[PDB]
């Protein structure tokens with residue numbers, strides 16, 4: 202087979218995990234996607250002259266979750282820039298990933314979503330300071346304008362390649 206990448210999208214309720222995933226896959230913005238629907242999605246992509254399948258768990262609400270945490274190769278830590286609590290929660294999501302990998306050394310990208318909204322309560326400097334503390338990239342996205350969406354997923358792929366031979 203071609204190269205596959207197993208990605209897991211995590212973060213608090215309502216930050217835009219499903220909307221970011223739908224935008225990557227369907228190039229459209231969903232206003233209301235059932236918050237309860239946990240599913241995996243696939244997408245063939247070319248990234249730096251390599252054809253690959255992305256296998257993406259969009260977390261919601263489990264032997265599948267268990268298996269994706271055990272075998273997932275990289276994580277998007279998603280918060281919304283107009284949701285301070287969601288940003289504060291990132292710590293707890295990173296800690297759950299570290300438990301499961303028994304490791305500090307896990308490919309991750311910090312994603313600040315809803316960049317299109319004016320009610321921004323998490324500044325870029327807070328986000329950049331947290332990503333720096335974690336040793337990981339920070340990418341601002343809007344699932345609505347699609348800004349940063351490819352960037353976030355491609356950067357995670359590249360972080361996986363930096364960590365391991367594919």
Ligand SMILES: *CCC(=O)N1C[C@H](C)N(c2nc(=O)n3c4nc(c(Cl)cc24)-c2c(F)ccc(F)c2OCCOc2ccnc(C(C)C)c2-3)C[C@H]1C
Pocket residue numbers: 211212213214215236237260261262270293294297298301
């Ligand atoms: C709209 C509802 C919604 O999207 N969410 C977000 C998320 C799916 N969620 C949730 N809740 C929760 O209490 N914790 C989660 N932990 C994980 C995920 Cl995928 C989702 C949630 C999780 C990891 F991110 C990584 C490894 C892992 F094992 C894991 O699950 C552990 C069990 O859940 C725990 C355990 C400890 N803390 C937390 C929170 C981070 C505080 C979770 C449901 C809902 C809010």
Ligand SMILES: Nc1nc2c(ncn2[C@@H]2O[C@H](COP(=O)(O)OP(=O)(O)O)[C@@H](O)[C@H]2O)c(=O)[nH]1
Pocket residue numbers: 212213214215216217218219220221231232233234235236314315316317318342343344345346
């Ligand atoms: N304006 C705006 N709204 C968004 C964005 N991303 C998600 N939303 C909205 O925020 C709500 C929660 O999004 P959803 O993707 O379901 O959150 P999830 O619980 O993380 O999957 C929905 O009503 C989305 O339309 C964004 O980038 N911009």
Ligand SMILES: [Mg+2]
Pocket residue numbers: 218219220234235236237238259260261
């Ligand atoms: Mg969702």
